[PDB]
From a paper:
GP is an allosteric enzyme that catalyses the first step of glycogen degradation in the liver and muscle to produce glucose-1-phosphate. GP senses plasma levels of glucose to ensure that glycogenolysis is halted when glucose is abundant in plasma. This is achieved through allosteric binding of glucose to GP and stabilization of a conformation that enables the inactivation of the enzyme. Here, we present the structure-based design and organic synthesis of two new GP glucopyranosyl inhibitors as well as the kinetic and X-ray crystallography assessment of the new compounds.
Within the series of tested molecules, 4 proved to be the most potent inhibitor with a Ki of 9.7 μM against rmGPb and 19.4 μM against the pharmacologically relevant hlGPa. However, the two compounds bind significantly different at the enzyme active site and the biphenyl moieties point to different directions as a result of their meta and para connection, respectively. Instead, in the 4 complex, atom O2 of the linker forms a hydrogen bond to the main chain amide of Leu136, a hydrogen bond previously observed for other acyl-glucopyranose derivative complexes. Structural comparison of the rmGPb-4 complex with the rmGPb-2 complex reveals that although the glucopyranose atoms are at almost identical positions at the active site C1′ shifts by ~0.4 Å to best orient the biphenyl moiety (there is a 47° inclination between the phenyl rings of 2 and 4) and hence the hydrogen bond of N1 to the main chain carbonyl oxygen of His377 is lost (distance in the rmGPb-4 complex, 4.2 Å). However, this loss is compensated by the formation of a hydrogen bond of O2 to the main chain amide of Leu136. Therefore, it seems that the 15 additional van der Waals contacts (applying a distance cut off of 4.0 Å using the program CONTACT as implemented in CCP4) of the terminal phenyl group with the protein residues at the active site are the reason for the 8.3 times lower Ki value of 4 with respect to that of 2. Furthermore, despite the fact that the two terminal phenyl groups of 3 and 4 are inclined by ~15° to each other, both are involved in cation-π stacking interactions to the imidazole ring of His341. Thus, the structural basis of the variation in the inhibitory potency between 3 and 4 seems to lie within the energy cost associated with the significant conformational change of the 280s loop triggered by the binding of 3 but not by the binding of 4. For compound 4 the congruence is even more striking as the docked pose and the observed orientation in the co-crystal structure are identical.
Author numbering:
A (entry chain A), B (entry chain A): 12 to 254, 261 to 314, 324 to 836
Amino acid sequence: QISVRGLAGVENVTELKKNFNRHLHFTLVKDRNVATPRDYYFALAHTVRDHLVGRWIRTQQHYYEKDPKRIYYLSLEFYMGRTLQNTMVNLALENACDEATYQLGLDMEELEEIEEDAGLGNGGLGRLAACFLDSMATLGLAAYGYGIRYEFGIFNQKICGGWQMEEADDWLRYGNPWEKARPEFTLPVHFYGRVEHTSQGAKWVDTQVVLAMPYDTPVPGYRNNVVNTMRLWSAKAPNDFNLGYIQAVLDRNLAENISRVLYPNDNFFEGKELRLKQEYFVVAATLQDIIRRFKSSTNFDAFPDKVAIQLNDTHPSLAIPELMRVLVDLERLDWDKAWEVTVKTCAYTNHTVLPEALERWPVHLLETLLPRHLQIIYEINQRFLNRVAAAFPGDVDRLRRMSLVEEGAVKRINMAHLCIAGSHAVNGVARIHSEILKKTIFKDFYELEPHKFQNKTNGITPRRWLVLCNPGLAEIIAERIGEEYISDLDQLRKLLSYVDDEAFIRDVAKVKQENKLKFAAYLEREYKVHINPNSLFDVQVKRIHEYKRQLLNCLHVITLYNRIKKEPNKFVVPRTVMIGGKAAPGYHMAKMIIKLITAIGDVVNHDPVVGDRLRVIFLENYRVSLAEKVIPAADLSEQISTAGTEASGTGNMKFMLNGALTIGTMDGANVEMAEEAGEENFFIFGMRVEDVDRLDQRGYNAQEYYDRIPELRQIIEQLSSGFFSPKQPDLFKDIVNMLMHHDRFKVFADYEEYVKCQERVSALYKNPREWTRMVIRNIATSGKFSSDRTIAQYAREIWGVEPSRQRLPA
Amino acid sequence: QISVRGLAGVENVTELKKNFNRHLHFTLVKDRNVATPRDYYFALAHTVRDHLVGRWIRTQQHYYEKDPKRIYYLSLEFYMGRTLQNTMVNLALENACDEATYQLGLDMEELEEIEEDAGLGNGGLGRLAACFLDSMATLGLAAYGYGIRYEFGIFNQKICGGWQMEEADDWLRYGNPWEKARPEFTLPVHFYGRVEHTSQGAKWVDTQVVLAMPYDTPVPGYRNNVVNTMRLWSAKAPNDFNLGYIQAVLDRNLAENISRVLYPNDNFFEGKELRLKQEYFVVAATLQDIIRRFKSSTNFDAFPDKVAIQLNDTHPSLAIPELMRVLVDLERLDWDKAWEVTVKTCAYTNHTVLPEALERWPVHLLETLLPRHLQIIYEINQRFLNRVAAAFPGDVDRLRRMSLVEEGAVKRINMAHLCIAGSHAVNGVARIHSEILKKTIFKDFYELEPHKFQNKTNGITPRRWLVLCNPGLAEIIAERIGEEYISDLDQLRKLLSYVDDEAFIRDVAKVKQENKLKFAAYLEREYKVHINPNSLFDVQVKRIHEYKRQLLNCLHVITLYNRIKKEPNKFVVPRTVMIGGKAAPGYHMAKMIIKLITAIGDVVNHDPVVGDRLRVIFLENYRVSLAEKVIPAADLSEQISTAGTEASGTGNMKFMLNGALTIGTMDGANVEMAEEAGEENFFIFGMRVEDVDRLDQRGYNAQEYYDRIPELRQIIEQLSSGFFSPKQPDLFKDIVNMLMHHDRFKVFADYEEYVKCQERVSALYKNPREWTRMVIRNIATSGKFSSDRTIAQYAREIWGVEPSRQRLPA
Ligand SMILES: O=C(N[C@@H]1O[C@H](CO)[C@@H](O)[C@H](O)[C@H]1O)c1ccc(-c2ccccc2)cc1
Ligand SMILES: O=C(N[C@@H]1O[C@H](CO)[C@@H](O)[C@H](O)[C@H]1O)c1ccc(-c2ccccc2)cc1
Ligand SMILES: *Cc1c(COP(=O)(O)O)cnc(C)c1O
Ligand SMILES: *Cc1c(COP(=O)(O)O)cnc(C)c1O
């Protein structure tokens, strides 16, 4: 149908159809009289997986022969989404499969919708891991994703009476055709025990054993025939476990609970034992695998020449003392040499700014669970603090601040401090964030070891986030400038010479309109709610958190509603305001915010005076596959975190790539985005970081804004009085209370500038041609935010490997 | 190589090799440089499964079009063993696969050994279910096996210091290629709740839901292209289950524990709630499936014309009140019509004689778990007892004896009484057993409804138990009389005209010798123990139970040892005595018997005066695939249960088919076996049933035998004094105590006749030609004990369907 989706050759189509029918018959054990659409999806999925297999085998063979330096991306989260369409895109198979399935009387798009998301992540950090795997394969890096195969991913969100209800994401119920169990590579992981000291050093004994069984998932690069591996570990009990009889067999589940469920918190540390077990489990099994692969290339001096281990936040920070344990206790290297190897191997990416997001594990937990690792940590700390003392003699406070061990009622290990000490590189995820790490959060560490601190600004894969989710936009771009941009996104700058081309202006606006019609129809069939597709699509999608300030958006929504009610016969630009995201099950305030959003919708969407001029929709179950639908349909991207709180953001980049304008603060990657596009093509508002600090010094008094802004006072009275909750008039008194007395994120401080900037957006939307010309300037300068750029920088400045765009043989 | 294993055509072999390599590449994602032998097995298993698929689809299609009466075999146990070789045999693929694999440089026999047994059964009852499925497919019956897919089957037995240790049978660790998950046919099963009575009858409400997910396994008939289905249910939690958050997800395991593990007791009732849940789970899910299939053929009068439900013991007896519940509460039939339908649909096979084997469920358990079923049971009982009263007016004792409800400290439901009341047929499993049911155990029920009681003598499939496990014997038979006997085992009578043919005598003895050499070598490689293969192979394999009298065998073994030590320079026929079997984990006495066996071995096998004349081997981990090796190697089959205690036995039949002579009591099917072969070709000894009764009436005094038999007294003193346990002299005092004061099974009463009969066996073994002529007379009259005969009788006399040997099209 469209060029970027590849060729549908007569021999390709014939062979796909034949293999589809072979899989339906032999693999699925169905004929066409009893086949459900689910069977059709599985037949297609198996048919496409078959095209991966030879490339996957030959790529793993190639790495054995060449023996390149190997990159191990350790993460507790991989937010992969669906695999079928992505696999088709990267193998140039999409049109051929479309044609093949069409000839069998099937709609491929309908079959694609049957696939479960692999929702093994919470949000940005997990999705970054996924984009990164794609980019590493596309740049021909010998890279391995290592994580946990959770039986239950991020929960499925249902809305019941406007409240979030959580249900279990049983994503493996029907089978995962993309994974391959590798039970032959099963490895023991140890827990508990105690440490004996002998003649020949320390010995970790009397441990409980849990087995780690790996599952391999292919990660195809973009049309280069490279297929890398994501290896996810599953927990299995050994067969002698607890071995009255029946109960011993049933208790096998205690050990297997390790890989049962993803912890569903965004930027919040919960110090639970099960979570610690997950962290050690992935680290122990992965390091044995890395070391085994290294011995099949005595001499651990070459280990950092052949191995790079990237730590995706502190969640796998135990890799550091585990590598030390293996090298010292098992391989019998002296401490100093082992430490040299460890520091040169490991690198740490920080994603965090809020102090409640930092992992600080109670010492009593580590003492019980990982007694040897605690000893190694203490030894690391002592030696580290001796360097600090020698560099800053007499600075006793610095010693206390920099310690890996925090004193207090409960002693804790600061895992971030551990990562900095034991890594040769520490990076933030956007320029402003990496600067904040150097200036404030890790200032002391920066002064000791300035050379460690880098920036690597985040990115997104333009395969999933453009070609896959927005084929129509990809095509019109490809008509003008060719297909090379898909793996070299900087080439989008060539679109700047089309900013005054009427045909291209018309095509860009037409694709957007088509995407809005398609998303409006999706809301009709799946959720039975009607939206005006001529309205401006004002979208805020991301996890629900106070720092992300969905509440600021709510205040604007209510402001528009009250303005309409005040002057009902005045023209306003119509809006559909869509807000979506999951709240962590324990985060009471996030759950109240969801309830406020749906309660606003209950008033606004049923007011006959409003009409189709304003609609508020809570998008249920926001996940990777919903982002693929809603982002291409958006006009306005809401990126409105309090300055200094969003480390980078990546949603922001997805929207920029797909033809939405951005309203946002100078936070995270918004700053770099505005810099690339020009500030005049960005709706910037609010306090800068420096303004937030000035406010903190003198003190944030929310009452002052309430006293001075009549429009704001009205909204607070409506919330307080039960205007949005007539049956329970005090329902939202916690939200009012927080805003007035305990707001860490200064919602009122940015209110006035936000509402005003929102008026400028509405004004620009009245002029479709100039709106679209500004959109083109955004898309045209989105190139920097390809994860290919990001990974090339990791590769050159941290891992010490050159990326390649050369194809392996087919 | 040999004719009964089928043709190895050039096109067959070429196509198998090509598909083996396709599966190795695409299915397993390996090349030949990294493939483990496990991969080779899986590639072969997938290659063979592909030949099942079209027949399986076409057979299920054929049953939809013809709409024959359907047989549902409900069992909590299916002891299937390995599937690969059986599938090859029944598809005539064995030689072609042998050739194909040989040309790829692989030994098929080595690959076969990698397959895990499906050990979803304890012993005879479970193995009967498996043989029956094979026979039902071979006789072209529209039959379905329904059970539970246990994650852990019968435990793997290890011997440690002569003691049994149990470990978990993690048979699904590497995947089961033979099953096909059918998540689309998932069904709810209810537990707990309470009963509301309304205008429109009873309503079972406030229940907990567990999902039943079916897995289908193909059951090929012998070369008829029929492939029937075994459907096993797995327990799954619903996604709203317990839905703080993390704990709710982890608690999903409580519901899924239902299908976790097989209860490992042989002829012993343990009234545990989890076991009751298993029984209801298989019954509820199966009956919904039966009813759904029946509605795709209002009118439940035709239900017994289209459905037969066979109850394999009382374990699925809840089918009776569940069928009533569905018909009365959900379909709104009146009670009497529903009961007519139920009785005509259901039939009950009894396997039991010992009172501790009968299921008697406490009323408080049923009250909590299945409150509606308890009501239905009470109503069934009341109406049943009104019939008894009217037929036997004034016989108050009969009412008490026949009640489904047993009075006592704890009130109980007798499930056997329920089965008799609610079934149109009740059968025992051998003639003597079925007579004992009529004369003693269910005498009262027989007097009420004589027409219900039948016999169906057990059998064994000669596919697995001859062609598969003893190809060499099958071949020499086939040289003389052709291949037709494999599905018409009565044809073995033609071998009686070869009883004086020297060539056939030599061939029969040669095959036996080859099998003994092969089994002797197996003990060498896998268990490092050396046996004289010129010795008589004296084998007792079966579960460890007091009633089976392994202890009687031990007494004989010790007798021979003491006779040798008394007169060391006298000739004795050499013996290897092999005893094998698992003890139930809680059965202390069974575990002591294992320990005694290995302790006898410790003395006997290391005495230099004994030499290779006597060896005692405990065969570890007795299971279906070990029976396939040891049974063809046996000379003497030990079937020595106290008369009246072994309902049938089936091991006995396996040995007779494979060229062993039998030493045994007139118990179970031994009686019919001796009758078929002639008593002169059988080593019969001991008390008959009538003799046991005479002993019980006057009282069993073990001391009397101890006082009168010097050889027995010596053995008891050796056990008591620590002769077999020098380090713990009192180790076996529980065994001595039981034998002397509390022996239910009268071991000493049969001792003298057993030892004497054992001397006659030794005498016949000195004359190889006459030994082999007697063997031929046994094999030649083993035809009756084909499960094909057994199933044809179930079919005609209980289910009302004609078996067919006509082939479906290929
Ligand atoms: O997703 C996260 N962070 C996001 O990372 C992306 C990618 O760099 C940034 O764009 C974004 O600004 C930032 O918020 C995240 C971080 C820590 C935990 C966590 C988990 C367990 C315990 C403690 C914290 C859970 C989630
Ligand atoms: O395997 C069994 N019985 C055997 O059945 C075969 C086939 O008919 C006969 O040849 C043999 O004589 C007889 O012993 C068996 C019966 C009940 C339970 C059981 C399970 C749970 C609770 C209570 C009893 C467990 C096992
Ligand atoms: C990109 C993405 C995120 C992260 O978005 P932010 O706006 O950076 O928080 C979260 N969830 C999903 C499903 C995504 O696709
Ligand atoms: C046939 C068989 C049995 C039953 O044997 P009995 O001698 O009748 O108890 C038990 N276990 C296995 C593995 C079998 O093959």
